[PDB]
Design an enzyme around this catalytic site. Structure first.
Site, PDB file in Angstrom:
ATOM      1  N   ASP A   1      -5.872   0.048  -1.296  1.00  0.00           N
ATOM      2  CA  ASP A   1      -4.482  -0.755  -0.997  1.00  0.00           C
ATOM      3  C   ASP A   1      -4.032  -0.336   0.226  1.00  0.00           C
ATOM      4  O   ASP A   1      -5.012  -0.674   1.167  1.00  0.00           O
ATOM      5  CB  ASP A   1      -3.477   0.108  -2.144  1.00  0.00           C
ATOM      6  CG  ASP A   1      -2.354  -0.869  -2.156  1.00  0.00           C
ATOM      7  OD1 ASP A   1      -1.613  -0.710  -2.992  1.00  0.00           O
ATOM      8  OD2 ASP A   1      -2.250  -1.769  -1.301  1.00  0.00           O
TER       9      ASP A   1
ATOM     10  N   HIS B   1       4.103   0.811   0.165  1.00  0.00           N
ATOM     11  CA  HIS B   1       3.555   0.521  -1.165  1.00  0.00           C
ATOM     12  C   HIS B   1       2.283   1.343  -1.650  1.00  0.00           C
ATOM     13  O   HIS B   1       2.240   1.689  -2.937  1.00  0.00           O
ATOM     14  CB  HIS B   1       2.828  -0.899  -0.878  1.00  0.00           C
ATOM     15  CG  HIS B   1       2.458  -1.631  -1.990  1.00  0.00           C
ATOM     16  ND1 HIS B   1       3.461  -2.055  -3.004  1.00  0.00           N
ATOM     17  CD2 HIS B   1       1.302  -1.657  -2.565  1.00  0.00           C
ATOM     18  CE1 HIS B   1       2.662  -2.663  -4.022  1.00  0.00           C
ATOM     19  NE2 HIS B   1       1.617  -2.516  -4.062  1.00  0.00           N
TER      20      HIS B   1
ATOM     21  N   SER C   1       2.307  -5.229  -9.488  1.00  0.00           N
ATOM     22  CA  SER C   1       1.783  -4.028  -8.524  1.00  0.00           C
ATOM     23  C   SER C   1       1.823  -2.590  -9.128  1.00  0.00           C
ATOM     24  O   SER C   1       0.757  -1.872  -8.723  1.00  0.00           O
ATOM     25  CB  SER C   1       2.292  -4.204  -7.141  1.00  0.00           C
ATOM     26  OG  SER C   1       3.369  -4.260  -7.144  1.00  0.00           O
TER      27      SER C   1
END
Lengths: 279, 70, 404
Positions: free
Chosen positions: C70, C102, C333
């Site tokens: 990621d 994130h 996600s």
């Protein structure tokens, strides 16, 4: 809970017999999935066994069983760990002596005055074992056992129990109107018989299997003949069929056993056919 | 050969035997029709007692259907 | 659109992580915070559906390596088992700092350790940001996390000309190529669960050549036995648009591959990748936020997210938006993070099973939707305790020979 026929040290204090366990009858795949799993019935694994104790005056090496004399009142068993002693239930003390025997047959008897100096500690879990012998049911007289789930409207918790009897828990007069299903699925995940007793539910909502589940994931309709059909949760589908009402809850473990038919939706029905096939 | 034609335009074969006739009715004598025309109608399964005697939990779905337009 | 095909001869050569061309940072890192009135002493609402108190009896998943491909991860005293794997955005990095908020949320939701009177690692050596008592706990506190920094919004090319290819599409080809390399690298690290939480949406009209990615998925899934789990794709991203569902007039194909308009990759390879959709905390599908493709296979919760704060030392609920507005995260996600934890727990209890078998164990124990198989949610909603204990047949699903 799982148990092994070779572990004589645990079978004997509980009240079981190696032959009796080996001759136990089968269990269906359907019921095997419904019952929740509990910890195994094995000899407690006392840590760091055999070493010397940290505290002074310890009556023996770590893992030895201690008891107090009967003349001063009801006997309390205990276990000596590295940093202190923790109490033991009567039924577990018997298992530790039998298993941890290695030729030894009895505990060390110590007086209250010398016992009171030892610090109290709690370092191992022992709540799995019952406190008295098992009242094993003789299967020849009770060949039927069932898992029961129930929830009362307005409650936050469902009740889970086990039932055992000579025959399926249905009224003697109604025994004639149990429905016998065809069985296309041979995977052993589909029932043989279905019964709709008093206060049955037609329109249902799927919920989790644990007693604390709160979700409501999908809507289904159960017919008198035993088949289940799915309903698309849309205002037009609900009102056309006449299902603007609140659905009753059901667990997935029990509901999955009925055969599944086609889905009911307004888009699926707007079709024409010359003639139907027969596979 | 004996055939039964429905108002929807489908044709079904009927067994010649006493059982099949007596059960459906059809005791009267049938009218004649030419095969070059009758074969143009779609065919369904034959109405035989020997195959009606079946049970099902669910039925098979029909491939290639047509739209109903309002 | 025809389902994907694979040519195993296209594998990319192995090598140390590094970008295809020099890059420079273009924006400042995102700030974070908490919504007014939250109380971290209560469990997050999404944890009720998972019934963790019963699932942890068999263990916490000790000894399993999970790779998080990621935007990287920032160390925190609650993640004592983090390993720096590499960086594809900056040549000098190692994947241990996330500028976009994130990356650390997804990782902390999988492995953060529960609260204690004292932390195991009280030291705080973490570096500054680059410029141009508590109920929370992960699903599997025992796992070991590998961080690899694959993508970020804050960086750009420092020679922007791109020749005969449109600057919009020129970046997609670089991403597809850079994604295959990260999957191959993560497999050689010995990871047993690979989690992908960033994906590309592409128009069905002239789809980008993915030959390199096809072989890379096959190598990690078969020869290295890794479980690959990917998100169905958030619908707020730049190019993702909604797909059509089953059509009753054409029973030819029940998943409707012939009506597809938007392709999501690597989620596209339904033979080797597990794709997760989203549902709310009550169980209804997030119809407006997840792409309902034909490849979807399972679903899990995706709201009321909570996680460890990067750039701080506490919890967070929201990220600083474009305006002064404080914006709350949600979407697929995060749902892919929940399943990554369940996959780790299952293949700790059944260590003899291969990847293709672990996937069947999760699929068959899920509560299904009204149509039996749908597109907004695959076979149903994930179910932890069921996956760990029911007697699932070892073979795949099969239809009956005759029904009469």
């Amino acid at each position: 809970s799982r148990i092994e026929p070779t572990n004589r040290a645990v079978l004997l204090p509980l009240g079981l017999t190696p032959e009796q366990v080996s001759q136990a009858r089968p269990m269906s795949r359907a019921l095997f999935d419904a019952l929740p799993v509990g910890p195994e019935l094995l000899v407690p694994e006392v840590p760091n066994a055999g070493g010397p104790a940290t505290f002074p005056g310890a009556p023996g090496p770590i893992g030895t069983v201690i008891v107090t004399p009967q003349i001063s009142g009801p006997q309390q068993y205990s276990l000596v760990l590295g940093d202190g002693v923790q109490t033991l239930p009567p039924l577990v003390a018997q298992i530790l002596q039998n298993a941890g025997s290695a030729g030894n047959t009895k505990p060390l008897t110590v007086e209250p005055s010398t016992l009171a100096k030892m610090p109290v500690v709690n370092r191992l879990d022992l709540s799995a074992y019952p406190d008295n012998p098992l009242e094993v049911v003789d299967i020849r007289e009770h060949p039927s056992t069932c898992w029961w789930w129930e929830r009362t409207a307005g409650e936050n918790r469902a009740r889970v129990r086990v039932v055992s009897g000579p025959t399926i828990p249905v009224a003697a007069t109604e025994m004639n109107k149990v429905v016998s299903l065809v069985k296309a699925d041979t995977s052993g995940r589909q029932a043989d018989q279905v019964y709709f007793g008093p206060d049955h539910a037609n329109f249902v909502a799927v919920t989790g299997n644990n007693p604390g589940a709160q979700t409501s994931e999908s809507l289904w309709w159960v017919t008198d003949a035993g088949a289940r059909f799915g309903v698309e949760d849309s205002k037009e589908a609900r009102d056309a069929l006449g299902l603007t009402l609140t659905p009753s809850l059901a667990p997935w473990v029990a509901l999955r056993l009925l055969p599944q038919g086609p889905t009911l939706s307004r888009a699926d029905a707007l079709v024409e056919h010359d003639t139907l096939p027969m596979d | 050969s004996l055939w039964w034609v429905t108002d929807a335009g489908a044709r079904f074969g009927v067994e010649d035997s006493k059982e099949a006739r007596d059960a459906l009715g059809l005791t009267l004598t049938p009218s004649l029709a030419p095969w070059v025309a009758l074969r143009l109608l779609p065919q369904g399964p034959t109405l035989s007692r020997a195959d009606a005697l079946v049970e099902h939990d669910t039925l098979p779905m029909d491939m290639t259907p047509a739209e109903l337009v309002v | 659109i025809s389902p994907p095909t694979i040519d195993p001869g296209a594998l990319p050569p192995d090598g140390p992580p590094g970008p295809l061309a020099p890059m420079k940072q273009n924006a400042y890192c995102t700030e974070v915070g908490v919504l007014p009135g939250t109380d971290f002493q209560l469990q997050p609402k999404y944890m009720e559906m998972l019934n963790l108190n019963e699932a942890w009896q068999f263990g916490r998943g000790d000894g399993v390596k999970v790779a998080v491909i990621d935007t990287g991860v920032t160390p925190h005293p609650r993640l004592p088992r983090l390993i720096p794997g590499g960086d594809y955005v900056m040549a000098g990095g190692d994947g241990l700092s996330d500028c976009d908020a994130h990356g650390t949320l997804v990782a902390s939701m999988i492995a953060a350790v529960p609260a204690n009177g004292a932390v195991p690692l009280p030291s705080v050596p973490r570096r500054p940001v680059t410029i141009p008592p508590d109920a929370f706990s992960g699903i599997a506190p025992g796992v070991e996390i590998i961080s690899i920094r694959q993508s970020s919004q804050a960086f750009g090319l420092k020679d922007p000309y791109t020749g005969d290819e449109d600057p919009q599409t020129a970046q997609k080809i670089d991403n597809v190529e850079t994604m295959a390399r990260a999957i191959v690298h993560a497999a050689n690290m010995g990871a047993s669960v690979i989690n992908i939480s960033d994906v590309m949406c592409m128009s069905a009209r002239n789809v980008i050549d993915q030959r390199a990615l096809g072989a890379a998925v096959h190598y990690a899934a078969v020869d290295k036995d890794a479980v690959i789990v990917a998100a169905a794709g958030d619908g707020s991203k730049k190019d993702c648009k909604q797909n059509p569902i089953f059509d009753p007039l054409q029973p030819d194909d029940p998943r409707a591959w012939n009506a597809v308009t938007t392709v999501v990759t690597p989620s596209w390879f339904h033979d080797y990748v597990l794709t997760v959709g989203a549902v709310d905390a009550n169980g209804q599908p997030l119809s407006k936020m997840s792409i309902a493709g034909p490849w979807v296979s399972i679903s899990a919760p995706g709201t009321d997210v909570v996680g460890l704060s990067p750039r701080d030392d506490g919890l967070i609920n929201a990220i600083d938006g474009p305006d002064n507005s404080l914006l709350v995260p949600a979407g697929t996600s995060f749902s892919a993070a929940i399943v990554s934890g369940v996959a780790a727990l299952v293949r700790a209890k059944f260590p003899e099973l291969s990847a293709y078998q672990i996937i069947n164990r999760l699929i068959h124990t899920a509560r299904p939707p009204a149509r039996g198989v749908d597109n907004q949610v695959g076979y149903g909603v994930v179910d932890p305790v069921a996956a760990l204990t029911w007697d699932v047949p070892k073979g795949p699903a099969e239809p009956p020979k005759q029904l009469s």
